[PDB]
Symmetry: C2
Subunit: 286 residues, 2 copies
């Protein structure tokens, strides 16, 4: 019996028999299909992390526009509670050469994410960093287990699959940067085939932003990802070992940050600019 | 990297995010994807055989209607000329419990239509004695000679479509034909995934033309136009025979009922009301 390879989250792919060019995927993000998703919980129920939408959008660029390109204005404002099976439909409609409107939805129909896919931006990779120089400039350690314990006090539960942040390094609240040691947990390394970035790794990077002292001081309570202004992968992210983040804005309502995922040599493998963290609507999880 | 099994012709399958329940497949019936389709030609152009639409419809029943079912009123529209890549979209929309409207289109031109039914508790027809069928149809018609005849009117069956070894008939007064027909060996490794391999089913359709009454009318080019009722009862991997019954044969066309049999004479697939005629070979 023949078979077709599929992205682990997007699932089965068709192009619709119409104009303009439009793509449709049907996937399953349930915990039976992806047991590691049981390890991202809000108020003790499994909820799809925002990092998963980021991966979906990233994975859609090549099939739709023919290049890995980048993703603009990704938003995900309606938390998805997971079941053993949780079907998702992903859509991409080409509006002009190099640009497509992207959507994710679940069955009553509920929108889960929107973005624009871009194939025409020839942005170049940011320059590499000296990991030693980054660490020297951020002398104060924040323990990953303690950071996750803090998350737990406000109802966000990261199990083993989402515990990839080992430690973060900061200076003071006046220096806007954080350097974190982060890696995909060992047991997930076999299954990261097919991902542009494994959502459990990307989420651990998002977590590291909260270690920043300015964020700790001012952005009080549940901070969850709500969107990302720009995402671009520059190569495989299999080897990510650090995340360098910059706090762009932080107030009582949330945080805006720019992130670079780095290999252990300091090479930039993925950029996420304008990550938004905020309270969101966790009312359904309650 | 994960993968998903797909039907060899229907291809990738999704359910649309809407009500009522509707399925969409996107496949490719081009000769690069399926080199064996190069071996069904009309005036030396590769053309999708009607038998392929029959398989698409049969294959769609279970995913849509959850279980065993059958196909009603399958009709083939403008004949589909094949290229290296020929995308096809198959649709099935549930209109009531146990019933769905079925369509095949290229892009837009409708290629086939049918109704899928899941709520028909049909009984499997009784098995036949192959030996008794053969004893009653003593007159052999050689498959190569039959295919040479088809050639004279522009229908070209290459190796993949040469599965009819011989047909056996009595006289024009007996409405039946018993054919020895098997999927050619090279295709038997791909047979996995098909309810019925279209190259096998087409060879069964060909056997109808061996009937003396059909021969007597001398219609010329006879191509499949539709099938009133298709039902599979088990795997067709071991089909070796086809018993056909001429229902009507005149200047307009031919209607026949077919049963695909294994060597034990067990009925594995029924195709009732096969319609053969002229169409639009232009």
């Amino acid at each position: 019996v023949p078979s077709v390879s599929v992205h682990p989250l997007l699932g089965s792919h068709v192009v619709l028999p119409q104009e303009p060019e439009e793509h449709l995927w049907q996937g399953d993000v349930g915990t039976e299909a992806h047991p590691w998703l049981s390890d991202h919980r809000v108020h003790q129920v499994a909820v799809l992390p925002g990092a998963a939408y980021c991966e979906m959008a990233l994975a859609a660029v090549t099939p739709v526009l023919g290049d890995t390109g980048e993703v603009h204005d990704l938003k995900f404002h309606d938390m998805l509670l997971l079941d053993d099976a949780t079907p998702v439909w992903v859509s991409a409609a080409v509006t002009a050469p190099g640009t497509a409107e992207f959507g994710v939805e679940t069955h009553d129909r509920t929108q889960r994410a929107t973005a624009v896919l871009r194939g025409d931006v020839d942005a170049e990779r940011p320059a590499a960093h000296s990991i030693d120089a980054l660490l020297a400039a951020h002398p104060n350690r924040v323990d990953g287990d303690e950071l996750r314990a803090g998350f737990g006090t406000v109802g966000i539960g990261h199990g083993a699959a989402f515990a990839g942040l080992s430690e973060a390094y900061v200076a003071t609240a006046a220096e806007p940067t954080v350097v974190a040691a982060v890696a995909l947990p060992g047991p997930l390394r076999s299954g990261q085939r097919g991902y542009t970035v494994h959502p459990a790794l990307l989420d651990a990077c998002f977590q590291s932003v909260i270690a920043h002292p300015e964020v700790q001081n001012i952005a009080s309570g549940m901070l969850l990802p709500l969107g990302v202004r720009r995402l671009r992968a520059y190569g495989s992210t299999r080897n990510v070992r650090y995340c360098l983040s910059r706090i762009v804005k932080a107030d009582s309502f949330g945080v805006e940050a720019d992130l670079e995922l780095l290999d252990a040599d300091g090479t930039v493998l993925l950029s996420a600019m304008g990550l938004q963290l905020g309270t969101g609507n966790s009312d359904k999880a309650e």
